[PDB]
Amino acid sequence: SDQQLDCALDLMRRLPPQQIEKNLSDLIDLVPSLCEDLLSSVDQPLKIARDKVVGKDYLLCDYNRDGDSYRSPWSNKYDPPLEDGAMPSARLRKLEVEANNAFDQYRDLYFEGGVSSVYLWDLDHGFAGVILIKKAGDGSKKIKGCWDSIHVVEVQEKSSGRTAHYKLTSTVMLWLQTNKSGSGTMNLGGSLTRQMEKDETVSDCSPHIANIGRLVEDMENKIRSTLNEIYFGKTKDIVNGLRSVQTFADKSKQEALKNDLVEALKRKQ
Amino acid sequence: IANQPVVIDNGSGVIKAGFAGDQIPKYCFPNYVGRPKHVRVMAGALEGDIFIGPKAEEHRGLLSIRYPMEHGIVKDWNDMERIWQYVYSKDQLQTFSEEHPVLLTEAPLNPRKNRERAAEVFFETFNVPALFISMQAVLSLYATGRTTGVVLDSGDGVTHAVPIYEGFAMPHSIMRIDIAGRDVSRFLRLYLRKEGYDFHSSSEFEIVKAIKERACYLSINPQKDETLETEKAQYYLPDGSTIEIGPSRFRAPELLFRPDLIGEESEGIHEVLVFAIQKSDMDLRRTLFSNIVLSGGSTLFKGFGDRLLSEVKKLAPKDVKIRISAPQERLYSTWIGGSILASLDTFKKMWVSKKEYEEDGARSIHRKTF
Amino acid sequence: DVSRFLRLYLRKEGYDFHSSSEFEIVKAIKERACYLSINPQKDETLETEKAQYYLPDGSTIEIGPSRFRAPELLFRPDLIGEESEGIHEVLVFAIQKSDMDLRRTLFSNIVLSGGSTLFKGFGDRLLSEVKKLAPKDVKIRISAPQERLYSTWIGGSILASLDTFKKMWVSKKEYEEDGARSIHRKTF
Amino acid sequence: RVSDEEKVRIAAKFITHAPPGEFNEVFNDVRLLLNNDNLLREGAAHAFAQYNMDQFTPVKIEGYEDQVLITEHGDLGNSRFLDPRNKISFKFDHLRKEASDPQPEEVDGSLKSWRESCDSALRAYVKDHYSNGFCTVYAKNIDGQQTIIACIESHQFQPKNFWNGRWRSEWKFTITPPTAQVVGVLKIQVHYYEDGNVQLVSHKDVQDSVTVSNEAQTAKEFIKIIEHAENEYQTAISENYQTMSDTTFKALRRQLPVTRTKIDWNKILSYKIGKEMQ
Numbered sequence A: 001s002d003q004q005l006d007c008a009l010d011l012m013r014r015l016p017p018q019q020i021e022k023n024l025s026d027l028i029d030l031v032p033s034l035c036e037d038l039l040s041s042v043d044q045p046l047k048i049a050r051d052k053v054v055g056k057d058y059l060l061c062d063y064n065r066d067g068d069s070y071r072s073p074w075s076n077k078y079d080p081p082l083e084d085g086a087m088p089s090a091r092l093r094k095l096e097v098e099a100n101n102a103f104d105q106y107r108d109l110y111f112e113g114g115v116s117s118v119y120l121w122d123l124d125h126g127f128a129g130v131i132l133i134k135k136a137g138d139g140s141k142k143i144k145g146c147w148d149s150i151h152v153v154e155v156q157e158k159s160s161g162r163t164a165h166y167k168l169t170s171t172v173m174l175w176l177q178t179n180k181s182g183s184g185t186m187n188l189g190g191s192l193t194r195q196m197e198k199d200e201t202v203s204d205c206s207p208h209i210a211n212i213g214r215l216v217e218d219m220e221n222k223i224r225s226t227l228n229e230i231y232f233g234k235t236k237d238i239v240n241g242l243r244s245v246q247t248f249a250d251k252s253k254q255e256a257l258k259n260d261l262v263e264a265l266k267r268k269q
Numbered sequence B: 001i002a003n004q005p006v007v008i009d010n011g012s013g014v015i016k017a018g019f020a021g022d023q024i025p026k027y028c029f030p031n032y033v034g035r036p037k038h039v040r041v042m043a044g045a046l047e048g049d050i051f052i053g054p055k056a057e058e059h060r061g062l063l064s065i066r067y068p069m070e071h072g073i074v075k076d077w078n079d080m081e082r083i084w085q086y087v088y089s090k091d092q093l094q095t096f097s098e099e100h101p102v103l104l105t106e107a108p109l110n111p112r113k114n115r116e117r118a119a120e121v122f123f124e125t126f127n128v129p130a131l132f133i134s135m136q137a138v139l140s141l142y143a144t145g146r147t148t149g150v151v152l153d154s155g156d157g158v159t160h161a162v163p164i165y166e167g168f169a170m171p172h173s174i175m176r177i178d179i180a181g182r183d184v185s186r187f188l189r190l191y192l193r194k195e196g197y198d199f200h201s202s203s204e205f206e207i208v209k210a211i212k213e214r215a216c217y218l219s220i221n222p223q224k225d226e227t228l229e230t231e232k233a234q235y236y237l238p239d240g241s242t243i244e245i246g247p248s249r250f251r252a253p254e255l256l257f258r259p260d261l262i263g264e265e266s267e268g269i270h271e272v273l274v275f276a277i278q279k280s281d282m283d284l285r286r287t288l289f290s291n292i293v294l295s296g297g298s299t300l301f302k303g304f305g306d307r308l309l310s311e312v313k314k315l316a317p318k319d320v321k322i323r324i325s326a327p328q329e330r331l332y333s334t335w336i337g338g339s340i341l342a343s344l345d346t347f348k349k350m351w352v353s354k355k356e357y358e359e360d361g362a363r364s365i366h367r368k369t370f
Numbered sequence C: 001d002v003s004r005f006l007r008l009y010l011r012k013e014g015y016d017f018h019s020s021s022e023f024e025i026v027k028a029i030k031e032r033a034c035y036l037s038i039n040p041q042k043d044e045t046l047e048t049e050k051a052q053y054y055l056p057d058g059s060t061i062e063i064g065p066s067r068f069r070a071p072e073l074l075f076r077p078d079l080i081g082e083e084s085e086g087i088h089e090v091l092v093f094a095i096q097k098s099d100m101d102l103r104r105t106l107f108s109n110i111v112l113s114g115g116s117t118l119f120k121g122f123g124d125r126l127l128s129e130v131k132k133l134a135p136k137d138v139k140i141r142i143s144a145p146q147e148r149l150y151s152t153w154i155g156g157s158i159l160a161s162l163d164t165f166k167k168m169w170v171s172k173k174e175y176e177e178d179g180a181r182s183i184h185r186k187t188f
Numbered sequence D: 001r002v003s004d005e006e007k008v009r010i011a012a013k014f015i016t017h018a019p020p021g022e023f024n025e026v027f028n029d030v031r032l033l034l035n036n037d038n039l040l041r042e043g044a045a046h047a048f049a050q051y052n053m054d055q056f057t058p059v060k061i062e063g064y065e066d067q068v069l070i071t072e073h074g075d076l077g078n079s080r081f082l083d084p085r086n087k088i089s090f091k092f093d094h095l096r097k098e099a100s101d102p103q104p105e106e107v108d109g110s111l112k113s114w115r116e117s118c119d120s121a122l123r124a125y126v127k128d129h130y131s132n133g134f135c136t137v138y139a140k141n142i143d144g145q146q147t148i149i150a151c152i153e154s155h156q157f158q159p160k161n162f163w164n165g166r167w168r169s170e171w172k173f174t175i176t177p178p179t180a181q182v183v184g185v186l187k188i189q190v191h192y193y194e195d196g197n198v199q200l201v202s203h204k205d206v207q208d209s210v211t212v213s214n215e216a217q218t219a220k221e222f223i224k225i226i227e228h229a230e231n232e233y234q235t236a237i238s239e240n241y242q243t244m245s246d247t248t249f250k251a252l253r254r255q256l257p258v259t260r261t262k263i264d265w266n267k268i269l270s271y272k273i274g275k276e277m278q
């Protein structure tokens, strides 16, 4: 049933990014023996939890999925009440609380709201973390958007000397809508994923978390940019290439002179 | 009229013009209008109060230099009319603006209203018999003679990347960002203020422009060069003074690669070129990566193409053929291509005739020009 | 510089002050005999009451028009012969060269400080000038606390008295290790 | 465990959301997955009928070289859509994508004059603004009302360039003679997946009216309303793409912060910015 899995992933690849959760559950309802085989490479939105003791929010994924509970980084507690989970290193717990702090600053600077979370775990010669960012559109506004970001980062620290090897994998799951009069309703799905790795020197002024912050910042700038120009301009190009606004036989004139100049440019070769 | 056509390049900082057929243009003057600051008292002083060309360059100490074209757009049509009249004055053409064909370049993706008002000016004020408008990229590839390629030119007001296929600019993949050499000059002025040598005057701003054009190079290492302590290469002011530039002669041209230094939501020139090629189809990426021409005046920095090659290696796909050509006639590639497109026999049908415009309007030009 | 230009105008009045220890008397005159005209030109086309002034020497100086045109320099540095801008243009350009999403918030919060903001009719003229340069129907609000001379010092007293200041300074050891680059590194 | 009757709703859900030009691939990924061709045979057959009747599927007519469109508004049961052009009935295999039985449809006669009239005017319009367009006009005396259901469809299926797109357009030319409230819809679905995944889904609920003055006048006038709304809609869509870096995305994620600078991570981590003080 391995070909069945390949076609299943391609089906999710071509599936409409509006009902990712429901249709993923449906596809799992086909072959439930292949269920938690798909929940590793099928990108879907996030789940907002609620830290009761702190009064914050924290997102849900597999990295915080300790057993079947979730480690709330604002409290380092598990919900459902599992007092047998895998607590992170106390060292990494302090590094994680400052990580959550720095990314709250990051999130507030670019997203001006939204929910974020940064979990962490070990490595033999380093550590690794995940960065969840979920920005839903302004509910008051008509723009029904939902920015979703997941950043798999793996700090492969070298021997000593404080130089590292920062491996990072990201993912953006966009969502957009406008109920504008000129467009009626213009829905706009979309999703990206990239990888980047750099070896920035670690120091007392340049900790690991700062290097990760620069990488996440650059990565999201590239993804948002890349999206907006390449992919969205590509869609605009497709709509313009399908139907043209200019009347034909006028386009035959401009394309006529265009082919004339094609002959002119390829005439003096 | 059956006479030689006049090719005009509306440079954002340096307007280049002259009759077609000529290879190198013999009439080049900057794009600004200066008015006298001080009050004239003595009789027999200068006459005119509006200086353009070499007169403005000689009397910089009197004129309050202002620009009429910022970021490709025209913000003062009176000044552009005066500069267009100066092109036909007794120092650049010594002819009329109503008895010759006229070729006018423009930056790509410009607003419709600019072409509209330019047509209004060139057809009502000047009674131009033949007027044709074009881009500043098509002409550069025409001058280089290549067929397909990506034009990365940088004027004093814009840096646009245009992938051209067989002599035509694909409108579906033109990239344009409002950043250029003038903004680098302003950024450079800010660093000079951060060094002591502050030049807070427009008549003194061209000295900063000369500093940009003479002692500014791009650094390959964005951090090792940043942490250096250079030899502080001196520069002589136009009076006899000295400026120890130091650590700001390279940070100032870095604006063209990251516009975050000025705080503007855009992308660097290398990223602009990457997106300009990736917006196009797969069928030409291998050829466009091997066909890049660095036109434009602002692309003359010492080490611009080298750092571009390094950044494209960091952004383009796996070890693809990255060929970037550096023509020595970079400053006038667009004008040379203008002479090429103007001296064509087929050119007798692309210009919008005077009667057509006067009886139809600019909409007819938009339905006819390209 | 306003005092310097005032010295020039006092010379044009006829009273000469050129000694270095007399330039201070010119500063004293700027501090207690100048004001800002609301209308910059309508008041210039009139003859004021020409109030007197008592020098430390005991003489008497009638100023006249050299009291409102002297601090006019701040709003027009053409009088000194310079292509710079006025104060109002510094505010409007500082606000407009920012994110468009913060312009209203910045126009609703303007704070003055520094001793030159103590002239009579300063804030009122600044409001008029900014209204002429700001876009229509945007609430402009200029605050002017009573400690404009002590604003930066009181702010220093609040900032340095915090526990985060320990981590905000530059230690002597650090300066001996890195050098001036450590200061430019931790300049904020 | 899930029953078999729910698999019909599952396959229907996967076919009714298949992007244009990618139906066969959804079929392969559902054939090699549902494992019972009988269940998806009946259920998915109805789903195929839906997916091919709603999206104005391009069907080839081998006799007259026209490539007519199958619109939901015309059928006689066993894929017996009535081709208005050439007055021929036809069967069609939704999977084979090949029509069958070009029997010369003995149409009862509803608005055949309007059918080819507005069809002709729309053929001119399609040949004017649509590159690979296709027109089809259904004439029907629906529930005691004469109507024209002019449909427009254009598409580009380029799998080598990893994209698709199918401009679909319907115009219920309600022939309510005193006031033809021509209300239709222009739904668009565009997919692009080169090194990623992007889907554009839109539609404009066009609403316009005109009195049915004459036939040729309302034919070309129907084209006038059509050219108006379509030029308007395509242009407006392009400018929505133009104003997206600063408005829609800024609702989601800004390009640069409100301070227009990068993040001094060394500053935030080294000390608290003064957020504790207000």
Ligand SMILES: Nc1ncnc2c1ncn2[C@@H]1O[C@H](COP(=O)(O)OP(=O)(O)O)[C@@H](O)[C@H]1O
Binding pocket: B009, B010, B011, B012, B013, B014, B015, B016, B154, B155, B156, B157, B180, B181, B182, B212, B213, B214, B296, B297, B298, B299, B300, B301, B331
């Ligand atoms: N040696 C140089 N180094 C850096 N910039 C230069 C040099 N020489 C000329 N320039 C730049 O050339 C620019 C002129 O723009 P230009 O390309 O002439 O506009 P256009 O291409 O629209 O005519 C100025 O910004 C100036 O900074």
